[PDB]
């Protein structure tokens, strides 16, 4: 079965670099153990050396940003015609799951308090703005929480007074 043959294998990247050609069987391409092959070009680049386990990748991000989570890292057996340690076929993946913690607390949103009384109208003649503010401390937020909505309603008011001409 033909396969694309590459002249160099870049470790820690899992990529075939330096294309030589296709239409050549896997046996001929892997006569030099420093080569690598990729079938159908979709992926699955594999070195020609004896199968040996690759390196543990960096930890995947913690499954949740809150309290205790779980994160994974993979390791693939790379090689041709052979088995890794443990009677494992080339292309198989091993995993290690680990508990992680980004931060201790997590945002518990607070509740709105009683409304502050209506502030006086922003102007003494014609029409103005009537502001109404409250606070977000019933209860108070922790970590990174915030109250839903806004903390200052604003309406209009008519003073029913004419300005001097």
């Amino acid at each position: 079965d033909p396969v694309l043959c590459f002249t160099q294998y870049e470790e820690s990247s899992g990529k075939c670099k330096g294309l030589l050609g296709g239409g050549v069987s896997v046996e001929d391409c892997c006569l030099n153990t420093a080569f690598a092959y990729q079938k159908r070009s979709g992926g699955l680049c594999q070195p020609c050396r004896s199968p040996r386990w690759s390196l543990w990748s960096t930890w995947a991000p913690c499954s949740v940003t809150c309290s205790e989570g779980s994160q994974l890292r993979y390791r693939r057996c790379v090689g041709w015609n052979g088995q890794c340690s443990g009677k494992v076929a080339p292309g198989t993946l091993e995993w290690q799951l680990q508990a992680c913690e980004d931060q201790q607390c997590c945002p518990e949103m607070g509740g709105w308090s009683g409304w502050g009384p209506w502030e006086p109208c922003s102007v003494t003649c014609s029409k103005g703005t009537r502001t109404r503010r409250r606070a977000c401390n019933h209860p108070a937020p922790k970590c990174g929480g915030h109250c839903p909505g806004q903390a200052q309603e604003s309406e209009a008011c008519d003073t029913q007074q004419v300005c001097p001409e």
């Binding site: 006569l31 030099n32 992926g43 990748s57 205790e68 779980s70 994974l72 680990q98 508990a99």
Partner: protein, 220 residues
């Protein structure tokens, strides 16, 4: 406007590699009908490549295997030397795995030997160590992974000379302990050897292909 044309192909380069696959190429020039005034130009390519196949494999050098297990600690002409001040010698072996096709042989010593004291199955006084670091989540990609840390009965090694002169070898060689002793310790939570506690791991992520997982999060 004078049409460009190709000349003769140059000599093909010899197969540069002495093993496996290589590559050859030929070099021709557009010097036979040279294009004039820039009207037309010679078409095609000025360099064709071919793959030269040599059936001989390539020398793959031998890489050392991981160390085997330490041999039992024995003294010559004394049979068992357990739980006694008797210096033995234990060996450890490697395997030059992978040397093929005139590859360079493995460099070093395939046999490691150290002087030892035997402590196999000896009853000793013990003491409970502190809580170990929380282990991994196991089984990964399995039903309900569970972490686990453990306190255990740490044996108290007998105060024997760690530095002994060997009469046969005329050397002052170090001695280390080897074996599985049977430690004695007051019961802690109803266990005489190792008491552990398990906690389930939270928000377990599914195990998918590193490429497939990458394409899945990107696509949402």
């Amino acid at each position: 406007g004078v049409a460009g044309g190709w000349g003769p192909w140059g000599p093909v380069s010899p197969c540069p590699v002495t093993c496996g696959l290589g590559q050859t190429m030929e070099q021709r020039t557009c010097n036979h009908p040279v294009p004039q005034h820039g009207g037309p130009f010679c078409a095609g390519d000025a360099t064709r490549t071919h793959i030269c196949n040599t059936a001989v494999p390539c020398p793959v050098d031998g890489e050392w295997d991981s160390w085997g297990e330490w041999s039992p600690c024995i003294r010559r002409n004394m049979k068992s030397i357990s739980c006694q001040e008797i210096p033995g010698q234990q060996s450890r072996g490697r395997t030059c795995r992978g040397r093929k096709f005139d590859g360079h042989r493995c460099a070093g010593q395939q046999q490691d030997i150290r002087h030892c004291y035997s402590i196999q199955h000896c009853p000793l006084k013990g003491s409970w160590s502190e809580w170990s670091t929380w282990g991994l989540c196991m089984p990964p990609c399995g039903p309900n992974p569970t972490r686990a840390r453990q306190r255990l009965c740490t044996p108290l090694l007998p105060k024997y000379p760690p530095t002994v002169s060997m009469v046969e070898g005329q050397g002052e060689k170090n001695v280390t302990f080897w074996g599985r002793p049977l430690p004695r310790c007051e019961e802690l939570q109803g266990q005489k050897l190792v008491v552990e506690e398990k906690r389930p791991c939270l928000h377990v992520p599914a195990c998918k292909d590193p490429e497939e997982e990458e394409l899945e999060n990107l696509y949402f």
